[PDB]
């Protein structure tokens, strides 16, 4: 059973996650495991009344819910379900938030027998005494069949101040053995996130995010070099095309030798391009359909999250991403908001 009520943050999010597990076709056992894993990872936030304001005005989601869901669609397969959580969200300040987040990661490492050595290597870079914003630690859980999830940790290159973003990112990549990766990164307006895979890997795997305030379809195609035409068509499809849009690229480095990324993702914040979620869902559905992906599952996933009409707001479909990975089929990922605190109006 569950100690959480539907008036509590944990009750709402576990209900949403359980329904999403059905869309992902996870069995009852795995579903129970992951609903409990989410509740535990939220800590005291799980029991917080939804009537109180969000403890932290987090960047994780627009309405400051410390959870966001995503579904990764591959051609002809049921989508894979992931959840992003901020374990330290119910804390008073950023330093306490980060401490609680690291504690959560350590508990996961103990439970699932993986090492935090690579993460520990970076602690002084990303968790200083008086950290800067906008966040401290997020955790992405890939909810795989079997009940043992994939785990990634997200860290803030601006933790030691905005002026040290590049210095911090470059020193982290160096410590991790990725001494040529920075040179592979496109021009950017921010380095909002560094992600580290945690698990059974003898060498670090990292993902570097770049914010582009005014990215063009042509530039997106350029940066996808690890392909160009699929990335440009995706840009137009999701952007609905003015000539430039705000977007993020992710650059995944899975070996330390070449300095070349093995993965590239274009993340399009569709919620910023459309009037309401009816339009955002339309564009995501069209992209999935064109790629031969499970577009019916998208509709079921949205309904699993909220029963509201899609046109009654915007931001439920937070992002659509095109994921390229050497040696794999392209993937489309749709990011879906919890809306535990607010529905942004059209
Ligand atoms: C309000 N959400 C933040 C962080 C974020 C959540 N999910 C993402 C997916 C892709 C890129 C970023 C994000 C933002 O929009 O930047
Ligand atoms: C959750 C955030 C902050 C960004 C998108 S998650 P991602 O690009 O790493 O997706 P994958 O783990 O590579 O499938």
């Amino acid at each position: 059973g569950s100690h959480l009520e539907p008036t509590q943050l944990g009750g709402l999010v576990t209900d949403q996650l359980a329904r999403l597990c059905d869309v992902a076709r996870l069995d009852r056992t795995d579903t129970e495991t992951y609903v409990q894993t989410l509740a535990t990872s939220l800590g005291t936030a799980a029991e917080r009344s939804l009537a109180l304001p969000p403890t932290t005005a987090t960047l994780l989601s627009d309405d400051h819910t410390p959870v966001e869901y995503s579904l990764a669609f591959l051609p002809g397969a049921t989508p894979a379900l992931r959840v992003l959580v901020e374990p330290g969200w119910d804390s008073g300040d950023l330093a306490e938030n980060g401490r609680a987040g690291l504690r959560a990661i350590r508990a996961m490492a103990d439970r699932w027998n993986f090492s935090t050595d690579q993460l520990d290597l970076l602690e002084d870079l990303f968790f200083p005494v008086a950290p800067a914003g906008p966040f401290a630690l997020w955790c992405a859980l890939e909810l795989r069949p079997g009940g043992v999830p994939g785990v990634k940790v997200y860290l803030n290159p601006a933790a030691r101040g905005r002026d040290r973003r590049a210095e911090t990112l470059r020193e982290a990549l160096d410590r991790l053995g990725h001494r040529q990766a920075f040179a592979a990164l496109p021009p950017a307006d921010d380095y909002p996130f560094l992600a580290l895979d945690l698990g059974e890997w003898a060498a670090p795997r990292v993902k570097v995010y770049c914010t582009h305030e005014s990215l063009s379809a042509q530039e997106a195609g350029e940066y996808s070099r690890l392909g160009r035409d699929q990335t440009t068509d995706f840009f137009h499809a999701v952007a609905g095309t003015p000539s430039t849009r705000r977007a993020l690229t992710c650059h995944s480095f899975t070996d330390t030798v070449t300095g070349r990324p093995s993965g590239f993702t274009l993340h399009m914040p569709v919620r910023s391009y459309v009037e309401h979620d009816g339009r955002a869902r339309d564009r995501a559905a069209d992209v999935l359909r064109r790629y031969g992906m499970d577009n019916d599952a998208l509709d079921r996933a949205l309904a699993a999250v909220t029963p509201r009409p899609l046109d009654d707001g915007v931001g439920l479909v937070a992002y659509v991403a095109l994921v390229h990975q050497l040696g794999r089929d392209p993937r489309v990922t749709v990011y879906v908001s919890s809306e535990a605190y607010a529905v942004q109006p059209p």
Side-chain angles (χ1 to χ4, degrees), residues 1-27 29-141 143-217 219-221 223-224 226-227 229 231-274 276-289 291-327 329-346:
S2 180
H3 66 285
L4 301 175
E5 296 174 351
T7 58
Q8 291 169 301
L9 173 59
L12 172 58
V13 177
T14 53
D15 284 351
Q16 287 175 330
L17 191 74
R19 301 184 210 112
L20 282 172
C21 290
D22 295 339
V23 184
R25 304 188 181 182
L26 291 178
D27 68 19
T29 303
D30 294 346
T31 303
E32 175 52 76
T33 294
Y34 291 146
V35 292
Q36 193 49 244
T37 294
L38 184 59
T40 296
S41 78
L42 283 168
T44 62
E47 298 82 25
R48 185 180 183 86
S49 172
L50 282 175
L52 294 177
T55 306
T56 299
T58 179
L59 171 68
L60 191 158
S61 63
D62 285 359
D63 78 341
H64 312 304
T65 308
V67 174
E68 182 185 78
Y69 314 102
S70 65
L71 287 176
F73 296 82
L74 299 116
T78 295
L81 178 60
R82 317 90 65 78
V83 60
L84 187 64
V85 60
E86 184 174 318
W89 173 95
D90 195 23
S91 66
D93 59 31
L94 262 181
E96 177 188 4
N97 185 309
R99 304 197 57 88
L102 291 178
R103 189 172 333 110
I105 294 296
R106 289 192 310 271
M108 292 174 192
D110 291 339
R111 182 180 180 182
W112 293 305
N113 321 322
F114 63 76
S115 180
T116 61
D117 288 353
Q118 300 294 332
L119 179 61
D120 303 336
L121 201 59
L122 310 176
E123 186 165 335
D124 59 300
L125 300 176
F126 291 104
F127 304 90
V129 297
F135 76 108
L137 184 153
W138 301 337
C139 177
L141 293 181
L143 308 185
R144 295 157 174 171
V148 180
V151 175
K152 294 182 164 66
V153 63
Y154 287 76
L155 301 176
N156 174 21
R160 302 183 303 169
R162 271 186 89 237
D163 284 358
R164 304 188 73 185
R165 284 173 284 176
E167 168 185 11
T168 297
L169 174 58
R170 291 180 126 203
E171 170 71 20
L173 293 168
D174 278 354
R175 297 187 186 176
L176 294 177
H178 288 277
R179 291 185 167 277
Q180 292 184 273
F182 188 88
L185 292 181
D189 301 311
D190 193 17
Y191 301 125
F193 314 112
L194 173 64
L196 178 61
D197 279 278
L198 296 181
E200 304 264 37
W201 285 288
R205 296 157 61 91
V206 299
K207 301 157 62 191
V208 188
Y209 291 75
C210 294
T211 297
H212 309 278
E213 298 292 350
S214 296
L215 186 70
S216 69
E219 294 172 327
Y223 302 161
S224 70
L226 282 173
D229 294 64
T231 299
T232 302
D233 296 341
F234 178 86
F235 184 104
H236 294 288
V238 175
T241 52
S243 198
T244 60
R245 298 300 235 264
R246 181 185 157 94
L248 286 81
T249 58
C250 178
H251 303 275
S252 177
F253 298 86
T254 52
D255 72 279
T256 55
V257 166
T258 66
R260 295 305 310 157
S262 60
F264 167 84
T265 295
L266 177 53
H267 291 275
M268 299 288 287
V270 66
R271 67 181 190 278
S272 302
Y273 309 156
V274 298
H276 57 74
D277 274 305
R279 309 274 191 264
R281 169 276 173 195
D282 286 352
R283 301 192 185 175
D286 292 346
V287 175
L288 295 175
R289 194 179 97 254
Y291 274 95
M293 292 158 183
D294 193 348
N295 64 277
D296 284 354
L298 172 60
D299 292 331
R300 287 193 293 274
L302 300 186
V305 168
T306 174
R308 71 163 178 90
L310 300 179
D311 69 326
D312 281 357
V314 73
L316 181 67
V317 188
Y319 280 88
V320 190
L322 183 58
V323 183
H324 293 151
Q325 190 162 338
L326 286 178
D329 290 340
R331 169 228 304 186
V332 175
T333 301
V334 187
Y335 295 79
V336 185
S337 306
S338 172
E339 296 183 342
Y341 290 99
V343 173
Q344 309 310 151

